[PDB]
């Protein structure tokens, strides 16, 4: 058996470049937090590993901090995947899959993970796949232009357009092309548009809009 | 449930310093191969990781290769722990527990893992404890004085090991003492201690297999 086979709520992964409006799109589901297990990317855990800020240390010295940073990131996504709930729906911001097919892969290309390290991570991903139950029912792709993504990131971190281009192509390879092992179906939103009002045609029966 | 809760054979962990005679001790169980799942240190996997040799690189440049080396070593020990068998006894050379409590701790103390890396590895060990079933019924501790183990390493000249200083052996000695004698680590099972300053070539030989030709007519 795999670990946490009992965690099987309908599990939606929100995927997107930096600055694809993931945070906005996710905030819209808050009204449903009583019926939906809502998990936003755990940046604050990356900023504070028993004292240490792995996020700064990585965007400062990526050659040194890549392996440890992606290692910890991978753990935190694995916790979100395996996190039990009595709710019928889980929506996660990103996934172990975006860690493996996008961030790790870009880090290998940019030379921040040598072949030694890369091979070790891939061996772990194969072990994780064999050993840990990861419910993935649906992916929502917030698909952007790198140009549009770069504008949004200005509003913060020192991130070049070229990094966003790199992450865009890997997202295109995974979610549009089918060049990675594909767990589930993908729905694409044009995240170039403003998504402030997405889904608002749907209203909760409990909303004051339906009071007498 | 945890992964591989089905792998439940009586599992014995052989632990000791570099040079404690673990390879000799394990080889004496070879006559029991039909009834024991015998799993020796997977050094060969560490010497070829889809082409790369991680052991060399770690003893060459520990500061760079410590995080990767110990992460992969951890994986290979997990593969032995979780390996299924129809035999009633599994005997493993070392464990994830020596990786965590001895080798990772020693690399942190020697500055080859910065706090960031150590903390990340600890979070994973805690997750592995929670997620993966690790059968541990017995530890046999091949206890040595560092000086006797130093001498044994010299007499072998095993290329990677040759240049290990006495001070490194002392460090790993004290980490084994803290775990297997002092109980300063979370202890899963009982420990039996051999005096591995002595030669163990002939240990257990009062016991002979009935199938042995010494009991042929
Ligand atoms: C799964 C995953 C999330 C993630 C985020 N990040 C960075 C990019 C953004 O600037 C920041 C907030 O998402 O974290 C990364 O470098 N690798 C990652 N992998
Ligand atoms: C679990 C574990 C085994 C192990 C072996 N080794 C080294 C010590 C010896 O020189 C060699 C074979 O025991 O491998 C290490 O550096 N870290 C390790 N961790």
- Topology pattern of chain A, helix = H, strand = E: EHEHHHEHHEHHE
Count of beta strands of chain A: 5
The multimeric state of the shown protein is homodimer
The set of bound ligands, ions and cofactors reads: Pyrrolo-dC
Class from secondary-structure proportions of chain A? alpha/beta
Overall CATH architecture of chain A = 3-Layer(aba) Sandwich
CATH class of chain A: Alpha Beta
Q: Helical element count of chain A?
A: 8
Strand order of the largest sheet of chain A: 2-3-1-4-5
Largest sheet of chain A: 5 strands, parallel
PDB class: transferase
Keywords: Transferase
Assembly: dimeric
Entry title: Deoxyribonucleoside Kinase
Describe the structure.
The structure is a homodimer. The first copy, chain A, has 212 residues and is of the alpha/beta class. Chain A has helices spanning 22-27, 43-46, 54-60, 62-82, 96-109, 115-131, 146-154, 161-176, and strands spanning 10-16, 36-39, 89-93, 138-143, 185-190. Chain A has a five-stranded parallel sheet with strand order 2-3-1-4-5. The termini of chain A are far apart. At the A-B interface, helix 4 and helix 6 of A face helix 4 and helix 6 of B. One Pyrrolo-dC (8LK) is lined by residues 18, 41, 43, 73, 77, 94, 98-99, 103, 160-161 of chain B. One Pyrrolo-dC binds next to helix 4 and helix 5 of chain B. Chain A: Monomer. Chain A: Belongs to the DCK/DGK family. Chain A: Keywords: ATP-binding, DNA synthesis, Kinase, Nucleotide-binding, Phosphoprotein, Transferase.
